[PDB]
Design a protein around this ligand. Structure first.
Ligand SMILES: Cc1cnc2c(S(=O)(=O)N3CCC(CCNCc4ccc(-c5ccccc5)c(Cl)c4)CC3)cccc2c1
Length: 331
């Protein structure tokens, strides 16, 4: 059976909190008054929610309403508790209220007003500096939630809002997030395929905050190399193959050995043998303006098989890739 693993940081943060902090099954939702909010316009739709701009009529505040599609009550409680625990954190969406929808009977989360810039208009105009800046802003949200004992587990472009006009950013969709407890075995069937860590793909359940750092690395690769998604698997198996064709099979098998992970002998044959590639082979005339030695060094230190060897959020924030942004922020 597999060798156990622990977060290198924020290991015991939840153990030191009152049980109610993380024991979301005990949480009692006190519903607000639905009549306080009038929907104004639809902003977007997901498979799990509909998002609207609304107005709080009690006081004339602009608000955003996320009307949840039916999900298991446990997972709704989890997301609410996490949002409440993280309220006020840097670049975390701020949950103002919780109301039941009259029509669908389903829950509606009410947030402090947030703006999204149509990314497509930005994508073609995003500088090397901009990427460093926004990556730093994401890292502030991740360091915060990790420090608060919470893994996002679904880091991806769709879960990152920017308001480019005001240089503002928000990490959204906390629906897959979970509390970190040392020893706990988590469901590996989380995150979008392109951003799943190797730990998920090889079925190592005793994972931690460092999952988010892999996903972040996948995002960084897609941005600097202009290749979205960067690791484009067509299935969960091929996802790991795409990774292995870049990082190499030697380090993959070293990881599996270190943690005594049992992998299907079939998987071993379809994985094959691949050299570790230099990152330079993915630089081309279109993307080279986004790529620096510092960007590649940083990327290298996120995208490791061994979850324990990846940078933490706080370490990442100290990395040379961010030096001029930090200096400039401290204007
Ligand atoms: C709570 C809530 C829920 N939804 C809301 C909606 S929505 O549902 O319509 N909405 C969902 C979110 C989606 C995100 C677009 N992300 C683009 C992006 C951003 C940053 C990066 C990036 C990272 C690192 C370095 C450089 C760039 C990249 Cl690569 C891409 C837009 C659409 C609108 C308004 C307010 C809402 C409020």
């Amino acid at each position: 059976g597999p060798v156990p693993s622990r977060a290198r940081v924020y290991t015991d943060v939840n153990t030191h909190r009152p049980r109610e902090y993380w024991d979301y099954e005990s949480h009692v939702v006190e519903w607000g008054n639905q009549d306080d909010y009038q929907l104004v316009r639809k902003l977007g739709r997901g498979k799990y929610s509909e998002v609207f701009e609304a107005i709080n009529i009690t006081n004339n505040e602009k608000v955003v309403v996320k009307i949840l599609k039916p999900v298991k009550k446990k997972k709704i409680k989890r997301e609410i508790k996490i949002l409440e625990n993280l309220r006020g954190g840097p670049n975390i969406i701020t949950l103002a209220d919780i109301v039941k929808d009259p029509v669908s009977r389903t829950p509606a989360l009410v947030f402090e007003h947030v703006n999204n810039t149509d990314f497509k208009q930005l994508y073609q105009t995003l500088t090397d500096y901009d990427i460093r800046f926004y990556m730093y802003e994401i890292l502030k949200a991740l360091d915060y939630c990790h420090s608060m004992g919470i893994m996002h587990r679904d880091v991806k472009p769709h879960n990152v809002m920017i308001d480019h006009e005001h240089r503002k950013l928000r990490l959204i969709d906390w629906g897959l997030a979970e509390f970190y407890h040392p020893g706990q075995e988590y469901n590996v069937r989380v995150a979008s395929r392109y951003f799943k860590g190797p730990e998920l793909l090889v079925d190592y359940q005793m994972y931690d905050y460092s999952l988010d750092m892999w996903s972040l690395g996948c995002m960084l690769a897609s941005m600097i190399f202009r290749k979205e998604p960067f690791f484009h698997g067509h299935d969960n198996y091929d996802q790991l193959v795409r990774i292995a064709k870049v990082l190499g099979t030697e380090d993959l098998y070293d990881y599996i050995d270190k943690y005594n992970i049992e992998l299907d002998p079939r998987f071993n044959d379809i994985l094959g043998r691949h050299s570790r590639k230099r990152w330079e082979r993915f630089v081309h005339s279109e993307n080279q303006h986004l790529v620096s030695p510092e960007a590649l060094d940083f990327l290298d230190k996120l995208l490791r098989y061994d979850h324990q060897s990846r940078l933490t959020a706080r370490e990442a924030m100290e990395h040379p890739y961010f030096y001029t942004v930090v200096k400039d922020q401290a204007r």
